[PDB]
From a paper:
Ku binds dsDNA by a preformed ring but C16 sterically blocks this access route, abrogating binding to a dsDNA end and its insertion into DNA-PK, thereby averting signalling into the downstream innate immunity system.
Dimerisation of the N-terminal domains involves antiparallel β-sheet interactions between residues Met1–Tyr4 on the edge strands of the central β-sheet from each subunit, and between residues Gly123-Lys126 on the outer β-sheet from each subunit. Interestingly, a piece of unattached density was evident, bound in a cleft formed at the interface of the two C16 molecules on the dyad axis of the N-terminal domains. This protein density did not correspond to any segment of the C16 molecules in the homodimer, which were fully accounted for. Unfortunately, the resolution of the map did not permit unambiguous identification of the sequence of residues present in this extra density, but is expected to contain largely negatively charged amino acids since the walls of the cleft are intensely positively charged, formed by lysines 115, 117, 126, 140, 142 and 143 from each of the N-terminal domains. This finding suggests that the cleft is likely to serve as a region for protein-protein interaction. Notably, the lysines involved in forming this cleft in C16 are not conserved in C4, which does not show the same propensity to oligomerisation. Supporting the idea that structural differences between the N-terminal domains of C4 and C16 reflect functional differences in the cell, the N-terminal domain of C16, but not that of C4, has been reported to interact with PHD219.
Residue numbers in the entry:
A (entry chain C), B (entry chain D): 1 to 161
Write the structure that this text describes.
């Protein structure tokens, strides 16, 4: 499932089984974290996972001409808390064939709740799988009921033709 | 707002400024209603609406070979105190590049509530605009609670290349 804009640019992408082995790799990388709700690890040493993510995005996208991935990878933990609609300050791109996305990979899918809600004038989207969504859109991290929730977030800039 | 599946077949279309040219004509068509919850008017001597719908679909849908429009219109009004449920539609096309859709054009929008909400194991979409979705999906009409919600339904059948 992928979502496009009226201009033609891709805005949202929903993954099902694309991130399988890198899930275990990210789990192993995140094993070295001590009591952090949101911890950012700059990743330029073991760039193998970054190369795999770049190749996956190159093969499973449309008309992609270049891909740029930020080195740092952030990890977030969630407990039965509230959270709210963390809007983005209307990041407006400059060109017309370029877009910066946030990619979220689920390390421990919550049993109940923990769905990334996305707000758009034409309609809302609620999902529980790995996501790649535009920084322009406004997202909410809905509260969980049972179980924990761990996510890995990356910033990726792509260009189209 | 384009939506595509893993095969590349378009599934959901969200028109914002597309049908706000014939909406008055649909309103005049709806006027001939006599206390029917869901009236399936066989409309034949109004083919101008069909022609404009076909033109819009041909122009704003990508990679189109033929659009087969059906010659009936179903007006459904949803009472504030009337509730609904799932639909659980089981239907699979027998060919590759072909899909039957359901075009919902809003004639009387509600003040709040009662959006059309669509199910999928990788995301749910809630919307209150002009929607066009395939018959392979289970959908729900949410409980309206303010005002009235009267919609017009066509039956689409599109074959691509």
């Amino acid at each position: 499932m992928d979502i496009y804009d009226d201009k033609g640019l891709q805005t949202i992408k929903l993954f099902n089984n694309e991130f399988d082995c890198i899930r275990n790799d990210i789990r192993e990388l995140f094993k070295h974290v001590t009591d952090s709700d949101s911890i950012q690890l700059p990743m330029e040493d073991n760039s193998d996972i970054i190369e795999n993510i770049r190749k996956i995005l190159y093969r499973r996208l449309k008309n992609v001409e270049c891909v740029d991935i930020d080195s740092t990878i952030t990890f977030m933990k969630y407990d039965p808390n509230d959270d709210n609609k963390r809007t983005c300050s209307n990041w407006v791109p400059l060109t017309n064939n370029y877009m910066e996305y946030c990619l979220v990979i689920y390390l421990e899918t919550p049993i109940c709740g923990g769905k990334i809600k996305l707000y758009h004038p034409t309609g809302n989207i609620k999902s529980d799988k790995d996501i790649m969504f535009a920084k322009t859109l406004d997202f909410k991290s809905k509260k969980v009921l049972t179980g924990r929730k761990t996510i890995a977030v990356l910033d990726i800039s792509v260009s189209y033709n």
